[PDB]
Amino acid sequence: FNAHLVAGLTPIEANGVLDFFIDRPLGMKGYILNLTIRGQGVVKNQGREFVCRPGDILLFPPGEIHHYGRHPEAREWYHQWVYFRPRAYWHEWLNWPSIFANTGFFRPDEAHQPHFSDLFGQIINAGQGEGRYSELLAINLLEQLLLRRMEAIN
Amino acid sequence: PLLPGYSFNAHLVAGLTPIEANGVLDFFIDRPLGMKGYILNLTIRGQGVVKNQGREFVCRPGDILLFPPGEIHHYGRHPEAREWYHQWVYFRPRAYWHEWLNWPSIFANTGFFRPDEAHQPHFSDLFGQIINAGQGEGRYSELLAINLLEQLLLRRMEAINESLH
Numbered sequence A: 001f002n003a004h005l006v007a008g009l010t011p012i013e014a015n016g017v018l019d020f021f022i023d024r025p026l027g028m029k030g031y032i033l034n035l036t037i038r039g040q041g042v043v044k045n046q047g048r049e050f051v052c053r054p055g056d057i058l059l060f061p062p063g064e065i066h067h068y069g070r071h072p073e074a075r076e077w078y079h080q081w082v083y084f085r086p087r088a089y090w091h092e093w094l095n096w097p098s099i100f101a102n103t104g105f106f107r108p109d110e111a112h113q114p115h116f117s118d119l120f121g122q123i124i125n126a127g128q129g130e131g132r133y134s135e136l137l138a139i140n141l142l143e144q145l146l147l148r149r150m151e152a153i154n
Numbered sequence B: 001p002l003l004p005g006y007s008f009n010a011h012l013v014a015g016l017t018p019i020e021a022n023g024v025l026d027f028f029i030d031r032p033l034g035m036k037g038y039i040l041n042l043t044i045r046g047q048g049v050v051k052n053q054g055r056e057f058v059c060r061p062g063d064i065l066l067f068p069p070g071e072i073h074h075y076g077r078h079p080e081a082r083e084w085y086h087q088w089v090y091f092r093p094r095a096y097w098h099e100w101l102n103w104p105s106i107f108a109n110t111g112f113f114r115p116d117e118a119h120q121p122h123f124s125d126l127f128g129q130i131i132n133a134g135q136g137e138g139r140y141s142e143l144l145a146i147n148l149l150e151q152l153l154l155r156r157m158e159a160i161n162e163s164l165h
Helices: A088-094 A113-128 A134-152 B095-100 B120-134 B141-162
Strands: A005-013 A022-024 A031-039 A041-045 A048-052 A057-060 A066-070 A076-084 A098-100 A103-106 B012-020 B029-031 B038-046 B048-052 B055-059 B064-067 B073-077 B083-091 B105-107 B110-113
Touching (some): A005 A113, A031 A113, B012 B120, B012 B141, B038 B073, B055 B105, B073 B083, B083 B120, B083 B141
Antiparallel strands (some): A005 A076, A041 A066, B012 B083, B029 B073
């Protein structure tokens, strides 16, 4: 199984078996990009909270605190994630402005939201494909997403 | 630095050559010692003739050719053709691309890839994006072009990987 990029969808339903905030103080070894597709969510970090709506991409550097879950007034919090080990030269494009601590955040303007959510959607599919070149495609597409953000931020 | 006088890009440059019969561009290009970087060439309209030591080959719309460093370049509009519009991209590959740059040759070490009738639009379309980004003035256009080129090469590996024969 993959040793570079993994992805998937976590559909949180109210009172479902997955309806609960996840918490890992020691973060993780790899990075994580989070995109909220259905409903709302909320991240936490030492008392501080942030609500993520549809079309929001959150970045979680290695070791960063992971504490988020569905928003109590949201019927659900569906989000797509991508766990990865970036390429050496990718770091410059991973310096996102953090809502707090070192948790990057990016909210595409109303006009770019469609493209980004879609590219991200392709990354998820590539990441879950069985094809021998599936992972390399997801990696490539992830890189495109990053690169697109850099130019999108002008 | 990749191509002095055309662009400032040091890694990837690209352009379009709309050769029309009897026009300013209606002439053959001859490079007996090739070029330092790689070249990918896509015919989008008309026909061309690729020559290499007494041998010829007729490239058609959708045909992508690969000319590696030092390989000989000798091509131009096919005489029986009204024109020959082709898009090209000159570049220095990233180190890990080489496994995906060893294409089947039509002769010598001149690569060749004619996509499936069903994949033609996707490759030709992706090839254009690379062109547009490779010529972009944006701070990250060259980088995006390199990314798109990497995509194209991967799509080809993936495509060959499951086609038949």
